[PDB]
Amino acid sequence: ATFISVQLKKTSEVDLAKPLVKFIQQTYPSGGEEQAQYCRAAEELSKLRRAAVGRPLDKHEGALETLLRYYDQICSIEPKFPFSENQICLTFTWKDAFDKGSLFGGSVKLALASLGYEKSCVLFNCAALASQIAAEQNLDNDEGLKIAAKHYQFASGAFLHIKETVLSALSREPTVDISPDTVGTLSLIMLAQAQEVFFLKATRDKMKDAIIAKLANQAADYFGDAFKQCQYKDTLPKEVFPVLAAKHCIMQANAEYHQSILAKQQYYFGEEIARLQHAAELIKTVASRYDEYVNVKDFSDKINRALAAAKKDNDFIYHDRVPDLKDLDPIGKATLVKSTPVNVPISQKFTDLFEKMVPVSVQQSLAAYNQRKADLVNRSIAQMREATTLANGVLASLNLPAAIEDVSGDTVPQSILTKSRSVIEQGGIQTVDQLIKELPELLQRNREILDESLRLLDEEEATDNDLRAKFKERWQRTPSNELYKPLRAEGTNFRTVLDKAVQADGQVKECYQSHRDTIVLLCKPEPELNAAIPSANPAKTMQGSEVVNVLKSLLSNLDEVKKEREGLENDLKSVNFDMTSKFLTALAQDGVINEEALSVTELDRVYGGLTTKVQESLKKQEGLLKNIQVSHQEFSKMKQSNNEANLREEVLKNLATAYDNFVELVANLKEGTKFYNELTEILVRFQNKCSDIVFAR
Template sequence: GGELSARLDSCRRPAVCLARTAAEVLDMATFISVQLKKTSEVDLAKPLVKFIQQTYPSGGEEQAQYCRAAEELNKLRRAALGRPLDKHEGALETLLRYYDQICSIEPKFPFSENQICLTFTWKDAFDKGSLFGGSVKLALASLGYEKSCVLFNCAALASQIAAEQNLDNDEGLKITAKHYQFASGAFLHIKETVLSALNREPTVDISPDTVGTLSLIMLAQAQEVFFLKATRDKMKDAIIAKLANQAADYFGDAFKQCQYKDTLPKEVFPVLAAKHCIMQANAEYHQSILAKQQKKFGEEIARLQHAAELIKTVASRYDEYVNVKDFSDKISRALTAAKKDNDFIYHDRVPDLKDLDPIGKATLVKSTPVSVPISQKFTDLFENMVPVSVQQSLAAYNQRKADLVNRSIAQMREATTLANGVLASLNLPAAIEDISGDTVPQSILTKSTSVIEQGGIQTVDQLIKELPELLQRNREILDESLRLLDEEEATDNDLRAKFKERWQRTPSNELYKPLRAGKNVYKWGVYAEGRGERERISSTLLTNTEPDLGLELMTLRS
């Protein structure tokens, strides 16, 4: 640890820490953990309270409840980000609660430069600054930026907690693997969302390339933990070899991702390279034991030789990061014994490395997806607040409902006016008379007398003969009236289009709207004039004597 610290900037804490934990397979197992980002203080309460008071102007308990929640949110941010955090579960839980809370309030408050404008400032976790200048920082009025940075800190703290665990017991191994898989999933989530959340280039530490590599490193370390557990539990060598080979692949992929990119601190590269070689050597070592069990003594020697070469590379290049002396001695003893037995007893041909069957792979890890809420103790401070989008949708719904009701009422009133006009033209309901008695109603007798006095059926026939001519004349008058209205409206529209705002006259379609609305009544009246045959039948009945009228009414009643 002292030699590594001397190689780093002595004035600043390294952004990526190398934690070493005792393990059976390696004398010193080195894990990579990530430094937390630092932020400036932000007053969340003031702008949120202002918005709440504007949105709920009537005051009352609801407004007071949300204002108190805004103050609690401000305290939660200070607790999660305003002070150094210890490497324990309680500190991580506070961070997770704050992340869940800002995810929860995002749809409930209009965070933007034009409405609730909150500027969040964060420093680059991997930038150590210079002698005369501070580290790189970025300030954005974006809640998405705050979410990405907070989630980065959640992953970073999880990696630190994992590196502090005791791997000599199952509980420590379980906690370590869980935190590394969570950190991997959190970094992966940032990779997939950070560009859309910021709409600009982020700082290097949360760029997709950087967090993508960190995600793979955390996944590799989780796989390594399962390899350590399998070794500790003395599982079958075939299984241990596959676990180690998969871990070697993960470390190798992570090394390739950051080898030619200046995104992670330089002390990470040798650790990844060393881990890749060590895991490969472990895979070869345990596969050699399997070969010996299968009486493949030449293959045993070939695999042990390859393992010895890999460990020799680690010892010569990366000895300050990992101590592999005990593992190297273990391989040397096994190789010496295997060669001795083969030379004196088995005489099996030692194949070339390229001729050996590839070692299988077995993965027991995966990046834990980020699914809000992450915290097990999360309680939404604004649980009862309706999201802004829902409020807007409700307002739009109420407006559309009012428009629909008003249109329906207008249509109903228009239909009522039309019905009243038709009834009036038919002298209804005044023309309806009760005929349920035994005598002929006086009104019918009066009408009968009037018809007889005016000439009876002969006069009615004469009037009916005149109806077609009168009907045609009425139609011509109505059609001409409508044509004149259409012509006047067309002229009005042309002049309005020509003179625009200088044409101040009331539009024709509004001025003559009552006339056009009544045209159906007029048409119905014209149509009614053509019902002469029915009128003749009624008049014929009225020319009867009173006894005959009584008989006709009795027939109608029955």
């Protein structure tokens, strides 16, 4: 009993851990327990591939489950690494299963950095191994048949799946063995052989000849189509062609022989004989042309006995006319087989090593989302500040709201006194004197770290160039020069960072030198400060004016409008939406994650209320600034240009500008300090990459 099976494809060993850990780390918190398992999974994985492919093969469910498990686990990884860009290069090398190449050289090999290549080959080997285990079943007992039937159908389904994916999964052309046509024929061969197995069960179970005939006929139809496909393309091994021809005939004969029994049971004696003659013709040709692949003697004898006896009853008793074959009805067909669909997991008790790892399409949509959210928040925030800066600068420009608090040109207007006290309580100038003094020191600290860092590289690179010089042979290595190119690139950037930071130091310092005198004045105790603000004769005409009460509450609103920006900015920054689980839903419930529409929609939901209140502020300020500029210049009519009051006005306008500048300056200095301290953190790390690498060398 000869059944076709397929040989496994050979692959070269390939470091599977390498491109995976590399990325794994580029992706997680170093030392972080993420890496603790994900890197520990890409180990088991490489050790699995070794087992599922490198091993000299053992024809049992053990080695097949390992191979099945390997197919599963590979499929479970595609969405969780950036194979798509393929910038994560790992190369898979497979040989042809049949040594089939268009050009006349035995083995044609093919290596590809396509996980789709890997997938098709593992699956082909899965179908082939299944085909070999099927072919070994004992088709005399009930479980031999069940296992063979299940495996031929599995192989059929796997080969078919390969036929329908292989090209989309590969850029270029496949080796022959796995090309859609070769795998289409193998899938049909496997399906034919599973029909055969069912024909054999039907037989062993002594079912009605009508059934057995239809089963055998169906099998013949399968074997015949596979035969045809092979007739004018020779991409399968040498013994496959004759064997298909043989089994095609032997299955037609079995169909004839069983139908002939049905004919005799119906007294169609002429048909019985015609069908047996056909069966004998077929089996006779098989016996003499494919004796190398097939044994048909028992079948030939059983037919010959039935034909002899049928002819005896007919020649002597029945005298029924024997029909031409062209004139018989077709025998029917009944299929009990299905090529089995591939639906990972195909292995039993599958467990996905990287189940917890986040789909790469989700992490990309999360990052994209944050660049979108930062933009939303920063924009809104910067818009507001600029607007507050503008309004404060305008009010100063108008001596507002000092002017309308200035009842007697004799004392410190209340707004000035409040601002003064506000400044004194935050330390006064000695607060700004400190930050300005310590700024050049935080800068130095960082130059120093960057400098010692790079000196390390310079010094180790030096001895390395010397050693290679005096010991060419015993000191062969990649030069330090080449190894250090990356780190010296970070270095150079860092340098350009310090360039910008210093540039900003200079701007802040020039602002501090140009406003430090007024501020020192602003910080004086009330009487001393008052005695430094020139007196003026206050026009009492102003108390109660229409221009004044309007301006006054026109200014009240402007104040509320700006203390409002404080909560606003604080709310923009204090909220956050974790979008992962919303991205997961879009990916499970759907084929793809469309983040743009998804995040735009969530941003509008989370931030929309504020990005609208913010938006209100600005145009509400515009309304206020417009109304104030006009309503003021009317207050400018009642205004009276006497040099006593002009001096007073100068000084008041300047103290208010001084408050603004104090507030702004302190903020640019705290900012700059936070920056230099973060920079120390980042630079200290960079100094570790440097020493670690000078001492691994």
